[PDB]
Design a protein around this ligand. Structure first.
Ligand SMILES: COC(=O)N[C@H](C(=O)N[C@@H](Cc1ccccc1)[C@@H](O)CN(Cc1ccc(-c2ccccn2)cc1)NC(=O)[C@@H](NC(=O)OC)C(C)(C)C)C(C)(C)C
Lengths: 99, 99
């Protein structure tokens, strides 16, 4: 699909057996999801945005479906106001910026 | 052009007669530049990201050339690690996300 930027580029994702709304974010190195209790080992990490750093849990090799396109990679989980799909997954579905 | 996302989508912009590198950011509502002087009256504003809120200077109706494409719009200036081009200007240059 082609997604215009008149509104926030929110799409449906599937993860851990839940459907969620997430922002397709070319300004994000990493994928950061709202708090959820995924199974498996994780590692602590601190990630920084505009207002400073937050503590997140890093989970590896989590399958994520983005608009019916399959992806698998690292997901960070923590106190974010919005679910963010970053470049680590956007590359996997062949996402480009075009103008 | 078509820009892939295996690296950060940094492009050269021209603003106030100066050249700067900036991130094309579909997850940003607003355009936020590192601290710099711009001509004209500004008003204090607050904007929020991950890590919380920051105070910025809001400048209205600033021309910005993004990879040779002209935009004129609101530019915020404040403490950011990277220059961010957000949706307010991305829409002006006809930028879309495609996969
Ligand atoms: C209405 O809210 C917004 O649109 N808020 C904004 C914002 O922070 N956007 C976020 C996504 C977002 C939206 C709304 C609420 C919370 C978060 C991103 O589009 C841009 N942001 C802007 C940003 C980009 C880079 C950096 C940075 C950090 C360390 C070293 C180099 N750069 C910091 C902030 N990037 C990041 O925060 C990412 N950071 C990142 O990839 O760090 C490398 C995360 C996500 C992985 C944390 C702006 C201030 C830019 C307008």
């Amino acid at each position: 699909p082609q997604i215009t930027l008149w509104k926030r580029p929110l799409v449906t994702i599937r993860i851990g057996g839940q459907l969620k709304e997430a922002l397709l974010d070319t300004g994000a190195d990493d994928t950061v999801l709202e708090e959820m209790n995924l199974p498996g080992k994780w590692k602590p990490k601190m990630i920084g945005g505009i207002g400073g750093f937050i503590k997140v849990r890093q989970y590896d090799q989590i399958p994520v479906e983005i608009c019916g396109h399959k992806a698998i990679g690292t997901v960070l989980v923590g106190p974010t106001p919005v679910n963010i799909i970053g470049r680590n997954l956007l590359t996997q579905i062949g996402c480009t910026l075009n103008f």
